[PDB]
Amino acid sequence: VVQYLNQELVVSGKIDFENAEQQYQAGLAIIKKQTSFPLIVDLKQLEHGNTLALAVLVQWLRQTPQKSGLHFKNVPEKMLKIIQACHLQEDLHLV
Amino acid sequence: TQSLIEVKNLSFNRGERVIYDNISLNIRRGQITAIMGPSGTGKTTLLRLIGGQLVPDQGEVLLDGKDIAQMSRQELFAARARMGMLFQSGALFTDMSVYENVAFPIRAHTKLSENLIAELVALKLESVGLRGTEQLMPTELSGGMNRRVALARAIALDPDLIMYDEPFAGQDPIVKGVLTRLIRSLREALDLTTIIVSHDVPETLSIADYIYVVAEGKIQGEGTPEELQAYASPFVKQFLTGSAEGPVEYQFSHQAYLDNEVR
Amino acid sequence: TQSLIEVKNLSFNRGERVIYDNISLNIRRGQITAIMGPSGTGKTTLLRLIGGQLVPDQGEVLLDGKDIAQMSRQELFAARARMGMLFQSGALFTDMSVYENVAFPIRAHTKLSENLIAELVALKLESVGLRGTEQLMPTELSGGMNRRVALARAIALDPDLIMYDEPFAGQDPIVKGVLTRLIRSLREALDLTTIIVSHDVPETLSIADYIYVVAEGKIQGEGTPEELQAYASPFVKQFLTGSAEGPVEYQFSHQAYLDNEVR
Amino acid sequence: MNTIAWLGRLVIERIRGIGVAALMLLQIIFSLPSAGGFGRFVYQMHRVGVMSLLIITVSGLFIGLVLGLQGYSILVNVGSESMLGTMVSLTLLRELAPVVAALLFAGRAGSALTAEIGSMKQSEQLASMEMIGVDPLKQIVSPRLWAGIVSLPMLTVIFAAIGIVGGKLVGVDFLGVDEGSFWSGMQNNVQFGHDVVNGIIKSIVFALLCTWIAVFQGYACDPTPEGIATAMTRTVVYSSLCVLGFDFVLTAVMFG
Amino acid sequence: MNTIAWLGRLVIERIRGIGVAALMLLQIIFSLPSAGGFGRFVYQMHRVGVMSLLIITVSGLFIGLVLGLQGYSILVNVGSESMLGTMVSLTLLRELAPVVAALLFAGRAGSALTAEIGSMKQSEQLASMEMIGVDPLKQIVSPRLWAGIVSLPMLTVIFAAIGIVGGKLVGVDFLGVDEGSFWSGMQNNVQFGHDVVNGIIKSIVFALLCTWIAVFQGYACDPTPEGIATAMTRTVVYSSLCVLGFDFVLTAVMFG
Ligand SMILES: CCCCCC/C=C/CCCCCCCCCC(=O)O[C@H](COC(=O)CCCCCCCCCCCCCCC)COP(=O)(O)OC[C@@H](O)CO
Ligand SMILES: CCCCCC/C=C/CCCCCCCCCC(=O)O[C@H](COC(=O)CCCCCCCCCCCCCCC)COP(=O)(O)OC[C@@H](O)CO
Ligand SMILES: CCCCCC/C=C\CCCCCCCCCC(=O)O[C@H](COC(=O)CCCCCCCCCCCCCCC)COP(=O)(O)OC[C@@H](O)CO
Ligand SMILES: CCCCCC/C=C\CCCCCCCCCC(=O)O[C@H](COC(=O)CCCCCCCCCCCCCCC)COP(=O)(O)OC[C@@H](O)CO
Ligand SMILES: CCCCCC/C=C\CCCCCCCCCC(=O)O[C@H](COC(=O)CCCCCCCCCCCCCCC)COP(=O)(O)OC[C@@H](O)CO
Ligand SMILES: CCCCCC/C=C\CCCCCCCCCC(=O)O[C@H](COC(=O)CCCCCCCCCCCCCCC)COP(=O)(O)OC[C@@H](O)CO
């Protein structure tokens, strides 16, 4: 209900600073043991992404090969409104 | 026309001065609602009643059906986590730097780690346009930028209602220009519901969607900025134009000047 | 183009802050001259130099050829009988009442009888529109009417130069409307020469005849309000309109946000 | 009876003002402590206590110089110049060091507390803190109250110590009384529990009154630039009348 | 040496501030009188003098009550309870009535003078009066200076009179000393020229210092709402250090 591994991690559920500490920590444990880092995060099944779902995504980007090493799948149309609102419209990688 | 805040028949008084005699307002969701009026009145006292700092005398203010006056200490603390308010001077806490001003409402409604608080503050400050200014004091901030730090603090918990009182005042057209781009942009990016209490007519009508005009105790006109002027009372005209014809008097009372002995 | 006040190459400083680096201004007679600019600067410090309260550091201000800095105590006292100044708050002497506020500059430059002073005050107060209000204090005067008592005091000696600093600010369009009818009417009735120091662009261009724009130390543009916009620099544009394109920066400095360690 | 009605309306609003300030004090001292509240108290010990250290030190030295100069002129005519250290130390410890150090605390550290809280009310930082969901009585008012109750009894002990050092300097080192008789007459007649501790009990009562008045007048201010300045001269007048009024009551119990 | 440079820059601006206040005083007292200037002085005797009459009267009574209660306990053990009126009147007339009445004048009437002149500077009534052609040093500042030099020596005489009446009330009427020996011992040892006039000469020196500081800090203020409040606590600190500092110098001359 939060995230699995599934050969590239599927962020699911909802991040609203009452559970938003293990969802950063459990997702970080995948980043510890990943090899070569081409993995793409699947922002498929969120529904209330608001500036804190983004706050745990940038925290995963800082602990990665280089300063990037991370891609993203299709965005639920509420979260990439906040990507360009925070001028990160061309700083991450979206396929 | 689903209304978030809905006011019904309230009355306030401040030293036997009538403010809001008998007035009903509907604040619809996802829309800018402006409350214009002449100055010297208590125009900003509605935002003190919505957030809850003063108590009305014969009225009830409904936040999604729940009254704010009849509301305990753990419902009022949870209601205030859905509201932000930017005061006119941008009421920044002096001693606290720009980082712990923005992080003040976060640390009041959270138990968050230090590394995620420093990422929320860096994203709120940069969405306003103030990324590099985090460690310096509120003094020496070039006061048109004090109202931009105070907008990041008023938005940090990602609310659903934000209240501005007089954002358009004696400001530069450059400084007034940055705020009008920020008020429209931040409410599509976050799906907010804004209330603006001002009396800057050429700037408010170009940003609002439903204007109320409150002269002395009641609504003198309401509607879309297209239909407010067309169905205008003979007060809304003078106010929205500044002409000599209307109910307010330019002379003191009435005389002929050759009727009093001077000395 | 006969100039009453004529400024030539002055420089002022206030705590190592540059105000008026090297600037020359011509105040022609019988015409409204506006000095617009961004706020936070020392825009009102020119009117303190014309009337004579501060001293410039490398400059001379010429009142009809005579310099005000090199001027003795009986020429400066006689020069100030030709000038009036309305401050922004309308600096009325508290304990004094509406009658002895207006009669204060009369009793300083006259030896007049009591029955003619009470006729000058009754004609000055009524030419503004305040005939019946003579015996009551400055407190409880409904502060948009404080600036009308202070306009009668600033005009009582019938001067030839009157200086307003920020008459258009956070005011109602009704209160701002009375002043714009009074600024035009009083200078045809008395043949004055006005200087307005403001930053209210839509109101100033409709009342002025020669606008100077002073950004940081010098003129960025001058002329008739028709020709100021047509020959506009890429500062008078942003300023005159409030757009995003120009020399002033909306971002703090320059970064990419993925270049700093946060914490 | 136009001013008689104005006089009666004046003293009713002052009686009602004591009722608001009493309920404000019971809401501060009867509440649970919270997170990060000790560090706010140590910051306000710097603003109230350490900032007042220079007026208190120099004023205590100047008062001890006058006591040793005046007290020598009395005692030398009755053959009791050896009792100079007894009368210098007992005048400070039971009368002058609790009272004069509370009149300089009400002027410097009392009038600066009602200007800091009052300008937070004018610039609407107290209304902005309340609508966030933080009580300003706990965040702002409560560290400032406890820092004044601790700092004034710590400052009358420094007041009395330099007053005795200043009185020894004019008496022994300039007027020429015996040094061994200065300290031995003092160690014989001055008790610790009856003279030193009774001076600390006075300055704790004065520190509660001088700080509760200074904190109330800034909170219940009039947020207007000459409504703040009217409040700052009310904390100097009301604290000085309460210090001199409670001083007669405490000496009639302790030394009567 | 970053704060050492800040400390040296601080005491240079304070030395330069005494130079501006000295030239400001010589411009007031060496000038010709003008028209309507006596009526402005009688109005400021109401604001400075009559407004301070209630704090001075009640504080003088409370201090005389403590002096008659403490002075009875000393004198009764050496068989000299008839010298109670001598020590009560001579403690007030030469020490306490010049000094304590100047510490309450600096707090009430001194800090209210620097708030009234300072809010005229903020609201630009001083700049508007100057551009009309009237010197504000003569119209505004000069009636307020002379009303404080006259009102403080008139208020220490009322302070000393109720202190003796308050000390007679606890000594004679409650502790039971002889009434005829109270006044006869006082009329024998208290002289008019050496004890009463020397207390008035003290309070004229204190009234000049307490009013020149209070008037200067409002004129050379910082017209900003917490630049006025910083100035009001500077007139209470600087006047209290000057009152206690000049008190040692004046007793070493008069009674040394
Ligand atoms: C002949 C006898 C010789 C004396 C023998 C004593 C020997 C010396 C040893 C010890 C000294 C004892 C002297 C009495 C002590 C005075 C006690 C007192 O005066 O009590 C004070 C009351 O003060 C206030 O209300 C102002 C109210 C004052 C009225 C209080 C009435 C006091 C009555 C009870 C005291 C018993 C006195 C015992 C002495 C005989 C309280 O002081 P604090 O603890 O700081 O409380 C802090 C305050 O903020 C309260 O919250
Ligand atoms: C053994 C002798 C016993 C004494 C016998 C005297 C008998 C009693 C009779 C009369 C009392 C005389 C006692 C001395 C009087 C002190 C004079 C004094 O102290 O002079 C004061 C100086 O004060 C200031 O500067 C503060 C500066 C103080 C330093 C001044 C030095 C004074 C030196 C001359 C005084 C001669 C003393 C004569 C006494 C022997 C001036 O006081 P004012 O007139 O109010 O001036 C108003 C001020 O604002 C100045 O503008
Ligand atoms: C006889 C019984 C004891 C005498 C007292 C009698 C008075 C009645 C009882 C008082 C004690 C009751 C306990 C409750 C105290 C309530 C005050 C309080 O609890 O204040 C606290 C401050 O910490 C604080 O104790 C301030 C922190 C400590 C202050 C005191 C420090 C003591 C150190 C000096 C002690 C002297 C001992 C030295 C002896 C030589 C909490 O304030 P905040 O955290 O900022 O709130 C902020 C948030 O809520 C929202 O932002
Ligand atoms: C046995 C007997 C027991 C006795 C025990 C000993 C008694 C105590 C002994 C000594 C106590 C000395 C008092 C020290 C005062 C410390 C004050 C202090 O330390 O305060 C400082 C400022 O003091 C300031 O104004 C600078 C303050 C003014 C500077 C003073 C200038 C006057 C002196 C110069 C003139 C010389 C005197 C003339 C002599 C002929 C702090 O600076 P701020 O910028 O305000 O705050 C900074 C904060 O934000 C963070 O740091
Ligand atoms: C030893 C010599 C004398 C001691 C003094 C020593 C000090 C140095 C000399 C001082 C005297 C010099 C004379 C010049 C005085 C300059 C002050 C002055 O002249 O002030 C005047 C005020 O009147 C005024 O005297 C104020 C009006 C009178 C004030 C005093 C009133 C005296 C009443 C009490 C006297 C006590 C006597 C009682 C004895 C029991 C003029 O002010 P304004 O009219 O408002 O100006 C306004 C216009 O300019 C523009 O608007
Ligand atoms: C031989 C011995 C010699 C001794 C000689 C005698 C000594 C003097 C004796 C008496 C002196 C009494 C003092 C009188 C004080 C007069 C003050 C005054 O008269 O001031 C008035 C206001 O006082 C005000 O605040 C009202 C002030 C507060 C009112 C007081 C309320 C406290 C009292 C009520 C509580 C009772 C006390 C408790 C007892 C158990 C003036 O009013 P304002 O509106 O401000 O100004 C109006 C102006 O614009 C024009 O008029």
Author numbering:
A (entry chain C): 1 to 95
B (entry chain B), C (entry chain E): 10 to 272
D (entry chain A), E (entry chain D): 1 to 256
Wording from the paper:
The MlaFEDB complex is an ATP-binding cassette transporter to actively translocate the phospholipids between the inner membrane and the periplasmic protein MlaC4,5. The MlaFEDB-mediated glycerophospholipid (PL) transport was reported to play an important role in maintaining the integrity of the lipid membrane. Consistent with the previous reported low-resolution A. baumannii MlaFEDB map8 and our E. coli MlaFEDB map9 (EMD-30355), the MlaF (cytoplasmic nucleotide-binding domain, NBD), MlaE (transmembrane domain), MlaD (periplasmic phospholipid-binding domain), and MlaB (cytoplasmic auxiliary domain) subunits are assembled in a stoichiometry of 2:2:6:2. In summary, we characterize four structures of the A. baumannii MlaFEDB complex in nucleotide-free and vanadate-trapped conformations using single-particle cryo-EM.
The structure of MlaFEDB complex in nanodisc in nucleotide-free form was determined by cryogenic electron microscopy (cryo-EM). The final map of the MlaFEDB complex was well defined at 3.1 Å resolution, allowing us to build a nearly complete model for MlaFEDB, which includes a high-resolution structure of transmembrane helices (TMs) of MlaE and MlaD. The 3.1 Å resolution structure of nucleotide-free MlaFEDB reveals molecular details of the whole complex assembly and the glycerophospholipid binding, suggesting the unique and conserved features as compared to the E. coli MlaFEDB. Cryo-EM structure of MlaFEDB in nucleotide-free state also reveals glycerophospholipids bound inside the MlaE and MlaD, suggesting that the overexpressed A. baumannii MlaFEDB can bind glycerophospholipids from E. coli. Clusters of diacyl glycerophospholipid densities were resolved to be located in the central cavity and side cavities symmetrically. Two glycerophospholipids (PL center) are bound in the central cavity. Glycerophospholipid densities are also found on the two side cavities formed by MlaE and MlaD. The bound glycerophospholipids in the side cavity may play a role in the regulation of glycerophospholipid translocation or structural integrity of the complex. In the transmembrane region, the MlaFEDB complex consists of a total of 18 long helices in the inner membrane, formed by 2 subunits of MlaE and 6 subunits of MlaD. On the periplasmic side, the mammalian cell entry (MCE) domain of MlaD is assembled as a hexameric ring.
